[PDB]
Design a binder for these strands. Structure first.
Ligand SMILES: Nc1ccn([C@H]2CC[C@@H](COP(=O)(O)OP(=O)(O)OP(=O)(O)O)O2)c(=O)n1
Ligand SMILES: [Ca+2]
Ligand SMILES: [Ca+2]
Ligand SMILES: [Ca+2]
Length: 342
DNA sequence: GGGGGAAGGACTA
DNA sequence: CAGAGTCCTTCCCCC
């Protein structure tokens, strides 16, 4: 099994560059303006010109302006990025029918039947890079290896505009000299939780008795890390299928007033249904982000598809159930639809 | 003692 | 200051 991972570089900021080359060289910060207070909002993405100084995704726009007051700030234009992505994703499609689109800027190729050593995998990946660049002026990063996880890791180390391979040899080394916190799927909450157990490297998992691991990080994850270090990660590249679509929005001011929230909830619904394509969902979940940034949600599943009018009706009941069963003020509200009729 | 569905939360990209 | 989607886990109904 020879996986070829592709990952566009700071996609949103780069797409803004391709559309406006004058931005090339200058730090670019694509952000989401919440509309609460002037420059309120968060940073969605930024090019390396800004990354170098600490301006990264997740930080407050204000903060970003205190670090790079002269950097260029652009509002996020998801729709554009999405179309550019689609075009690229189609290019990749021509290099293997076995392709898994993980996200708007990530794809996993299973070139096992496409190549034989790793020398061409590298070369193949080279063609993919010179292809995407030649057609969309977008630089990406390729990470080749024996499985999705390591492929990604390879890519993580080679970004930006790179391409790294991981010989079964290095796979062995990494399982020993790589901080388990650089391993896909292991986040701060599991990173520390692991450290407490003394595990700092992937192989350190092979020691600890099982039930102790699948006791503090759950069975599933426990295995995942094990099978990975024990060099047995299987997981094939299967075509991903969107299982849920939805939209959440930030209100101008925290409220607990049903009549003050409805309008935000409905706008979120209109957008979701639009994005729903022709998909008919049987389940709808109203999601709310509290004042303390807590996330609560009430949903429901029907024995039939959901009509926009029913979405409007059921979403309001669920929102009420939320306000009944909770006291905190709501900051962000939204909806999400799933279980699409096939 | 699990299958299946609801609500939480971890991580993601 | 703090802006989409998948999977895993827990608690509960039910066979
Ligand atoms: N707090 C955060 C963190 C990340 N993201 C988004 C930013 C784009 C996507 C992927 O992030 P990275 O892959 O880390 O960066 P990138 O811009 O996608 O490109 P690169 O992979 O080269 O860093 O996740 C986000 O919306 N909010
Ligand atoms: Ca990327
Ligand atoms: Ca990590
Ligand atoms: Ca990443």
């Amino acid at each position: 099994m020879i996986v070829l991972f592709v990952d566009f570089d700071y996609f949103y900021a780069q797409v803004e560059e391709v559309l406006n080359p004058s931005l090339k060289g200058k730090p670019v910060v694509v952000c989401v303006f919440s509309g609460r207070f002037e420059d309120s909002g968060a940073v969605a993405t930024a090019n390396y010109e800004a990354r170098k100084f600490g301006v990264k995704a997740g930080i407050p726009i204000v903060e970003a302006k205190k670090i790079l007051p002269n950097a260029v700030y652009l509002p996020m234009r998801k729709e554009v990025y999405q179309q550019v992505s689609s075009r690229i994703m189609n290019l990749l499609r021509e290099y293997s029918e076995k392709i898994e689109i993980a996200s708007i800027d990530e794809a996993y190729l299973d070139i096992s039947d496409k190549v034989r050593d790793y020398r061409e995998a590298y070369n193949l990946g080279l063609e993919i890079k010179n292809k995407i660049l030649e057609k969309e002026k977008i630089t990406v990063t390729v990470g080749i290896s024996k499985n999705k996880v390591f492929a990604k890791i390879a890519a993580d180390m080679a970004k930006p505009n790179g391409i790294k391979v991981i010989d079964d040899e290095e796979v062995k080394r990494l399982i020993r000299e790589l901080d388990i916190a650089d391993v896909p799927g292991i986040g701060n909450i599991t990173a520390e939780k692991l450290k407490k157990l003394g595990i700092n490297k992937l192989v350190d998992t092979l020691s600890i008795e099982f039930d102790k691991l699948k006791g503090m990080i759950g069975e599933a994850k426990a295995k995942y890390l094990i099978s990975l270090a024990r060099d047995e990660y299987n997981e094939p590249i299967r075509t991903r299928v969107r299982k849920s679509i939805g939209r959440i929005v930030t209100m101008k001011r925290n409220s607990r007033n049903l009549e003050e929230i409805k309008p935000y909830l409905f706008r979120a619904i209109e957008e979701s249904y639009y994005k729903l394509d022709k998909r008919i969902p049987k389940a709808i979940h109203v999601v709310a982000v509290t004042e303390d940034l807590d996330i609560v949600s009430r949903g429901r599943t029907f024995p039939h598809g959901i009509s926009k009018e029913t979405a409007y009706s059921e979403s309001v009941k669920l929102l009420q159930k939320i306000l009944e069963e909770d006291e905190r003020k709501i900051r962000r509200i939204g909806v999400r639809f799933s279980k699409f009729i096939e």
